Assembly symmetry: C3
Homo-oligomer: 112 residues x 3
Amino acid sequence: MKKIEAIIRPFKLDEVKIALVNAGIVGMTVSEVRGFGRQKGQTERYRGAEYTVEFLQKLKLEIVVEDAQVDTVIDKIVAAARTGEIGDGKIFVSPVDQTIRIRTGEKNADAI
Amino acid sequence: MKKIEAIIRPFKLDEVKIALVNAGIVGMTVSEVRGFGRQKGQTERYRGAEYTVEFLQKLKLEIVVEDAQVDTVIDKIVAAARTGEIGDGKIFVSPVDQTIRIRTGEKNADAI
Amino acid sequence: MKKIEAIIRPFKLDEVKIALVNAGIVGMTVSEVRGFGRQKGQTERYRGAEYTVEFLQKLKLEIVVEDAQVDTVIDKIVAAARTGEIGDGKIFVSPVDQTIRIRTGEKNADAI
Ligand code: NI
Ligand code: NI
Ligand code: NI
């Protein structure tokens, strides 16, 4: 298995969430986090001519999927979370060796 | 080392927490997360004949242990977090290459 | 890439945060968590002669960096988060196989 983590803009939550559920992906978990981001400053020159780096609210999405589904999940998240502006966030993929379903004790494990 | 992550029902927190501490496991960290879960609907047919999938509160438990202790910790969590009903949650095991104790600088690392 | 996670005392947040940003490290994310810690008890014998283990607030810092930067980031965190007293926290290093920048779709991946 693989772990997919994504840091996104808070207002994009429902879009990403619904897009995944509609694609048949429902095992995501979301947590509130803080990170650095840009904030436009006042100017007459042009958009973004000046700005500051502030500590602000973001959301962390976590999903554990089979190795074969990784690319598909990434494509969905990228498509739904993108705005085209700086600060859209990043996706990190890491390994998960095994999963255990608490209710039944069922196990799913990677082989050496 | 290995990282053990578990997504459990909020009301099971104290049971799981105390069970682990009493077994000599005290390095757990807990965070609030949201995820999808079922919610029984009204009916006269039978329990669960109808229901909805909602975005609700859950808890994420994280513990880093030696490879040898993994199975033991999993057994404790499963035993304490289980209710037998759908939505009990899952446990994910992943790798941790090294740990550093901030106070002393002491290190513990895996070998290639 | 590698994932660096650190569990620190809440009041050390700004010190660690500023130290990292000033060193050119700005991709950190922070989340609130709870974990066990000591609490000094009343006594006339000596500092720490008695105490209790309580469930209290801590902060989890997460940063994904290139393998080459790991030691540098760890040194900064240790230096800034240390108080010298028990309960300073720990740092865990784990693998990250790939990163995807949501805005552009740009990818960075490890080789087999
Ligand atoms: Ni895996
Ligand atoms: Ni390990
Ligand atoms: Ni890597």
